[PDB]
Design a protein around this nucleic acid. Structure first.
Ligand code: MG
Ligand code: MG
Ligand code: MG
Ligand code: MG
Ligand code: MG
Ligand code: MG
Ligand code: MG
Ligand code: MG
Ligand code: MG
Ligand code: MG
Ligand code: MG
Ligand code: MG
Ligand code: MG
Ligand code: MG
Ligand code: MG
Ligand code: MG
Ligand code: MG
Ligand code: MG
Ligand code: MG
Ligand code: MG
Ligand code: MG
Ligand code: MG
Ligand code: MG
Ligand code: MG
Ligand code: MG
Ligand code: MG
Ligand code: MG
Ligand code: MG
Ligand code: MG
Ligand code: MG
Ligand code: MG
Ligand code: MG
Ligand code: MG
Ligand code: MG
Ligand code: MG
Ligand code: MG
Ligand code: MG
Ligand code: MG
Ligand code: MG
Ligand code: MG
Ligand code: MG
Ligand code: MG
Ligand code: MG
Ligand code: MG
Ligand code: MG
Ligand code: MG
Ligand code: MG
Ligand code: MG
Ligand code: MG
Ligand code: MG
Ligand code: MG
Ligand code: MG
Ligand code: MG
Ligand code: MG
Ligand code: MG
Ligand code: MG
Ligand code: MG
Ligand code: MG
Ligand code: MG
Ligand code: MG
Ligand code: MG
Ligand code: MG
Ligand code: MG
Ligand code: MG
Ligand code: MG
Ligand code: MG
Ligand code: MG
Ligand code: MG
Ligand code: MG
Ligand code: MG
Ligand code: MG
Ligand code: MG
Ligand code: MG
Ligand code: MG
Ligand code: MG
Ligand code: MG
Ligand code: MG
Ligand code: MG
Ligand code: MG
Ligand code: MG
Ligand code: MG
Ligand code: MG
Ligand code: MG
Ligand code: MG
Ligand code: MG
Ligand code: MG
Ligand code: MG
Ligand code: MG
Ligand code: ZN
Lengths: 357, 206, 60
RNA sequence: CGCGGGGUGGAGCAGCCUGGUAGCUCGUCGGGCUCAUAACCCGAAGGUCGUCGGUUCAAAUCCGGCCCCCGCAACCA
RNA sequence: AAAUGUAACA
RNA sequence: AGCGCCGGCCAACUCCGUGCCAGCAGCCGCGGUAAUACGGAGGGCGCGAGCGUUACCCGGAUUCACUGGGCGUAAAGGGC
RNA sequence: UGAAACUCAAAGGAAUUGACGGGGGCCCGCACAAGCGGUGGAGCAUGUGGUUUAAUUCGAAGCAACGCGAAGAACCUUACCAGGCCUUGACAUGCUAGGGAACCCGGGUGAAAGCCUGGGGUGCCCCGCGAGGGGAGCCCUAGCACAGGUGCUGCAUGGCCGUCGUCAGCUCGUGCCGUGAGGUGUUGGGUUAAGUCCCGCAACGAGCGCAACCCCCGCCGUUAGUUGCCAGCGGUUCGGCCGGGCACUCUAACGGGACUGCCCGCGAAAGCGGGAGGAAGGAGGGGACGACGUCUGGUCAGCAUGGCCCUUACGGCCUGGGCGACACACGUGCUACAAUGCCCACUACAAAGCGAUGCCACCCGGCAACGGGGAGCUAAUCGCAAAAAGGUGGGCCCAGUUCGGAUUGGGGUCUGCAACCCGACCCCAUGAAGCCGGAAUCGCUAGUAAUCGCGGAUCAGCCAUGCCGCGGUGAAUACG
């Protein structure tokens, strides 16, 4: 039963050679070993440091794949060197071997997921209906069920934050917290518009219809916009008010103006008579105005997302659920599972694992 | 999908069984199976002859098979060549005294199974199905029949949308018990699919 | 899984319980009558042809 | 800083003053009607009473301190 | 006295 | 010896690839796993040192009607 | 007075056929109403949605999916899952080469499959007193074609079925009307269960439907008399048992019988109302039978089939598990909540079916399930077999009970290689909900509903309270 598990360590390791490109990185590795090889290469060591750190960046690829074809091959000869001599220690000592290379290959599979800043934060899934309407709101509810059963069959927590059910039948939108480990790595390769070509049940004479719904996926940040006001950067002017007051207002510097230096935000207050009532008030107004800019930043980045976020429309898609000839196709890598109502059960691993290249 | 089979609806009134014998509880499944294999072998071999009905009789360890056909010579052979060969293959299968007769079909164009098989052959030959159906009905009516109806169902002409196409002439009273209506079915295999051919001939009411 | 099943049903088993009837005509394991060896469908089908001796449509 | 009014299910409000008992409407959930949805009909679930402490036998309720909310006032030079 | 049913009819 | 075309108009049909994608398109319309309509091929049709495309003019357009049109309800009787 | 940009491949007039209308007229169907019994509440059985799972295979989706395919899932079935295995292979047609054919019998390993292996004699037409030489009977081994797939598409199909709907309809030929789609006929008046029939009519005919021909039941006859029957006469062991007989009942083949045929009345007719005769009256009751077509209805998983896909595996064998899960939700049913009832004892009256490793009389052991004996019956003979409600007696006394029989403990029986998951039955003990059910909703017009039991298919056994049949008792109501 053991040589079936070498059969698989050679399977994930070959298309691991595909996106890593041993063929395109055994090449680049050589003229960095050539540039750094002539004695003048520590001439502007910025040039040098990037390449010696590159060199193991490519020798964790080239030479790690070089210990997978030699290593597995000295595993499969030692486990036949234990069957035909009845030597059971040559087969515990060629299995302690298969537990070591099952990690150098596990480590090399975290070039799929260890490359995305924060691919570990408890991410959120933002599903939306789309073209079509009732049909697509049905398909939207189908697709939340799909990712819920997915997340349960993967150790995530199925945590639903916000729903809104559609008025005919189904869901217009949903947001789930996929509270789990490394959750963003898996579900970010699920971002896209899921077309569902399908056969439709809401159309009277039973016509074949297309309806789309999207899945957008993001991680979790600090979401704290409470910047502290530090006196290193506030310049506070004091001067006289401009209206009524008497020998006062004239003869007293009651008005204050606080200007945040790096921003250029200015603020005044003249409302009361004490400069400290006014210095108080202008500190408030100055707090709130930098609370409104840091607001304007965040919304600005959000609108940058929204306007760069597809449209859930015709020809904007990634999948077929042609349930009238039983396929589900991911036009992007692209695979073709034929066991359709097994995908809705949560076999997304298929597409995901191959889509992380 | 509704109409009753027009022969099984007249068994013992206007039309008679094709396997006429008695058998007990312990035996009648085995004799039935042997009958159906007799019909398989003959029904493959005697197709070119023009096979219409296959009657079967059974007494005790002997069995008489009566083959109705439009071309008797294609069954008999040259002085009995094929006719003897049949008895050897036959009593090889039966394992018992297998008497094989042959009879006329006086008018093959009043034989509904024959008309059906002929149309099925025509439509396997890429012929025009509508034209062919009208012709078959005309041949049956010219041969003296009191009525005729022919139906063809499937991807007619290769079309992707399946269709049913039929023609009739005279009287075909499928609700009348005493009305004698021969019925036949023929299966046509094309490159694009199967078509079904049904032929009803109303010979006369009894 | 079927021609292997119409075939396994023929061979005598290791235990006489494992024996079932299959329809000798279409291979159906369901609604097989012992006295014809046929399933209900083939029973109706041959009966309509008249190739079942004595069998007829029953009406009362 | 002042005066006095509030915080009670998912939402909006009632309950305090004369303490023991938290109610109404909408919503939510299960069932019905309908081909289906809405509407309607039947049944159900649902509240640390902002917090700390504590009046009393006993606090949503009474009395202090803090925390957010609302209104008013902040004048004469 | 009582609302509505989109989007791919051979 | 090349160029256009081969769904109808409009002369010239099959195989494969694709699978509302890639693309075609003068009009009507083609393409959602058996596409004579997309792309290639075989074959075919039409011209030939040319063949197609774009632009523009007349024609078809009696669709500004002199030849040679209309106005109850199609556009069209003015309120008298 | 009066544009343009931009945009569309139409916007339009009239007329035709449908469909629809909270338009009308005239009709019909347990459609409503009139009734009677239920469902929805309870406990349980069963199917389904979900959820769970390694898998809880797959299909069915308003009526017309949901005790549906499933007329028998412990293994088998089985198509799913896990694990152990096989590679022209569980199976077809081949061609080639090695062994011996063929068939039976064991040994090892193993959960089994499988892998390993030790046994033993091949007819033929043949040179055969001789080694020896085959051919092809069939198997084995190695190949190459091929097999195999319940993998997809019922929106590529055949076949078969569901449905509107047993509704009264849908058409064609020729002629006539219209430029034409099309109309006419088929509409109209009357009538019928009916496009049934009558009358009228630019229509006159014809076909598919309706009806009839077919089956069961109701009366009677003829022919038959055992294994069925017994009116009368003999015996009568005390039982149609015997003689005897076929009358009667019956059984099962063939006929008769009802046609609005006959009288009254209304009618132009067709028919309708009433009466007699008759077992039966106006289709006598029930059945079989389902028009052109519709639902891109259902079934590629019964079968067949086009194409697409799998080929040491999307094929095949096996062992085990799952299809039987359970916070929930719906459909179909079973048993009930009691006195028109429950229990005990005794005692009557069916029909249709089934039955030779089958149905089992009778006897004995056991409280029993059952077991051990053992006769009969290829079954109008013998057996399943007792029908149950009912009847006659006795107990219960209105209570969660002598109602109800769920759940659980314990002890057994039988089938089966094997009842853990996951069988049915018996016995002791336990003895739940349920006091007649919200909104809502189903069936049935007469031997019907209600209620009572009996049989069968499937089937080793059975999760059947399901299905298909059979008879017993036997209502209420229909103004409209
Ligand atoms: Mg001023
Ligand atoms: Mg001053
Ligand atoms: Mg001052
Ligand atoms: Mg499913
Ligand atoms: Mg398989
Ligand atoms: Mg098959
Ligand atoms: Mg069995
Ligand atoms: Mg069976
Ligand atoms: Mg003042
Ligand atoms: Mg050209
Ligand atoms: Mg075309
Ligand atoms: Mg041209
Ligand atoms: Mg042409
Ligand atoms: Mg593409
Ligand atoms: Mg082109
Ligand atoms: Mg297609
Ligand atoms: Mg193609
Ligand atoms: Mg081809
Ligand atoms: Mg073209
Ligand atoms: Mg092309
Ligand atoms: Mg020239
Ligand atoms: Mg030019
Ligand atoms: Mg022009
Ligand atoms: Mg002009
Ligand atoms: Mg003019
Ligand atoms: Mg004009
Ligand atoms: Mg107008
Ligand atoms: Mg106008
Ligand atoms: Mg005027
Ligand atoms: Mg004007
Ligand atoms: Mg109009
Ligand atoms: Mg009209
Ligand atoms: Mg109406
Ligand atoms: Mg009703
Ligand atoms: Mg009612
Ligand atoms: Mg009622
Ligand atoms: Mg109820
Ligand atoms: Mg219930
Ligand atoms: Mg639920
Ligand atoms: Mg399913
Ligand atoms: Mg299912
Ligand atoms: Mg139903
Ligand atoms: Mg069953
Ligand atoms: Mg079991
Ligand atoms: Mg199984
Ligand atoms: Mg198995
Ligand atoms: Mg279909
Ligand atoms: Mg389907
Ligand atoms: Mg079909
Ligand atoms: Mg006109
Ligand atoms: Mg004319
Ligand atoms: Mg006409
Ligand atoms: Mg005409
Ligand atoms: Mg008509
Ligand atoms: Mg008409
Ligand atoms: Mg009339
Ligand atoms: Mg009728
Ligand atoms: Mg008529
Ligand atoms: Mg007339
Ligand atoms: Mg009839
Ligand atoms: Mg009788
Ligand atoms: Mg007599
Ligand atoms: Mg009458
Ligand atoms: Mg369909
Ligand atoms: Mg098939
Ligand atoms: Mg197929
Ligand atoms: Mg299928
Ligand atoms: Mg198994
Ligand atoms: Mg099992
Ligand atoms: Mg099941
Ligand atoms: Mg279970
Ligand atoms: Mg419920
Ligand atoms: Mg129920
Ligand atoms: Mg039940
Ligand atoms: Mg009941
Ligand atoms: Mg109790
Ligand atoms: Mg009790
Ligand atoms: Mg209680
Ligand atoms: Mg009581
Ligand atoms: Mg009730
Ligand atoms: Mg009751
Ligand atoms: Mg109600
Ligand atoms: Mg009725
Ligand atoms: Mg009862
Ligand atoms: Mg029973
Ligand atoms: Mg039985
Ligand atoms: Mg049984
Ligand atoms: Mg059970
Ligand atoms: Zn069958």
């Amino acid at each position: 039963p053991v040589n079936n598990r070498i059969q698989d360590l050679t399977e994930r390791s070959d298309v691991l050679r595909g996106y890593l490109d041993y063929d395109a990185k055994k090449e680049r590795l050589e003229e960095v070993n050539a540039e750094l090889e002539q004695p003048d290469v520590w001439n502007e060591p910025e040039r040098a440091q990037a390449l010696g750190k590159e060199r193991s960046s490519l020798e964790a690829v080239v030479d790690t794949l070089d210990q997978m074809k030699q290593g597995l091959e000295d595993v499969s000869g030692l486990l036949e060197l234990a069957v035909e001599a009845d030597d059971e220690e040559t087969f515990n000592e060629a299995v302690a071997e298969l537990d070591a290379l099952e990690e150098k290959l596990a480590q090399l599979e975290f070039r799929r997921m260890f490359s995305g800043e924060y691919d570990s934060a408890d991410c959120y899934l933002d599903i939306q209906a789309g073209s079509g309407g009732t049909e697509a709101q049905d398909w939207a509810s189908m697709l939340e069920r799909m990712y819920l059963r997915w997340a349960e069959s993967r150790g995530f927590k199925t945590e639903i934050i916000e729903e809104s059910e559609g008025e005919v039948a189904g869901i217009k939108s949903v947001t789930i917290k996929i509270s789990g480990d490394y959750a963003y790595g898996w579900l970010r390769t699920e971002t896209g518009v899921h077309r569902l070509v399908r056969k439709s049940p809401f159309d009277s004479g039973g016509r074949r219809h297309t309806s789309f719904s999207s899945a957008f996926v993001y991680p979790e940040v600090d979401d704290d916009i409470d910047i502290e006001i530090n006196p290193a950067d506030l310049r506070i002017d004091v001067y006289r008010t401009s209206g009524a007051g008497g020998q006062h207002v004239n003869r007293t510097e009651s008005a204050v103006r606080i200007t945040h230096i790096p921003t250029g935000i200015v603020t005044q207050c003249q409302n009361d008579r004490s400069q400290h009532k006014n210095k108080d008030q202008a500190m408030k107004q100055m707090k709130a105005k930098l609370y409104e800019l840091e607001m304007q930043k965040k919304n600005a980045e959000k609108q940058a997302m929204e306007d760069n976020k597809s449209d859930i429309g015709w020809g904007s898609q990634i999948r077929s659920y042609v349930l009238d000839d039983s396929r589900i196709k991911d036009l992007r890598t692209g695979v073709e599972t034929r066991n359709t109502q097994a995908v809705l059960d949560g076999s997304l691993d298929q597409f995901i694992e191959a889509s992380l290249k | 999908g509704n109409k009753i089979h027009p022969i099984g609806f007249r068994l013992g009134i206007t039309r008679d069984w094709e396997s006429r014998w008695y058998a007990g509880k312990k035996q009648y499944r085995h004799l039935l199976l042997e009958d159906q294999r007799i019909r398989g072998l003959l029904e493959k071999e005697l197709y070119s002859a023009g096979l219409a009905r296959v009657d079967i009789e059974r007494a005790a360890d002997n069995v008489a098979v009566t083959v109705h056909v439009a071309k008797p010579g294609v069954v008999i052979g040259r002085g009995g060549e094929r006719i003897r060969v049949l008895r050897e293959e036959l009593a090889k299968l039966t394992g018992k005294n297998v008497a094989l007769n042959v009879q006329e079909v006086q008018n093959p164009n009043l034989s509904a199974p024959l008309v059906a098989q002929r149309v099925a052959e025509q439509i396997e030959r890429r012929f025009a199905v509508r034209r062919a159906i009208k012709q078959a009905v005309q041949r049956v009516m010219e041969s003296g029949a009191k009525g005729a109806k022919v139906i063809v169902s499937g991807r007619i002409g290769g079309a992707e949308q399946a269709r049913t196409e039929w023609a009739a002439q005279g009287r075909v009273p499928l609700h009348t018990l005493r009305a004698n209506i021969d019925y036949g079915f023929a299966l046509a295999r094309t490159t694009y699919g199967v078509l079904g051919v049904k032929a009803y001939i109303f010979l006369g009411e009894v | 899984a079927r021609k292997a099943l119409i075939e396994k049903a023929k061979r005598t088993p290791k235990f006489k319980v494992r024996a079932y009837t299959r329809c000798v005509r279409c291979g159906r394991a369901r609604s097989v009558y012992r006295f014809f060896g046929l399933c209900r469908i083939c029973l109706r089908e041959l009966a309509h042809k008249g190739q079942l001796p004595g069998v007829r449509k029953a009406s009362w």
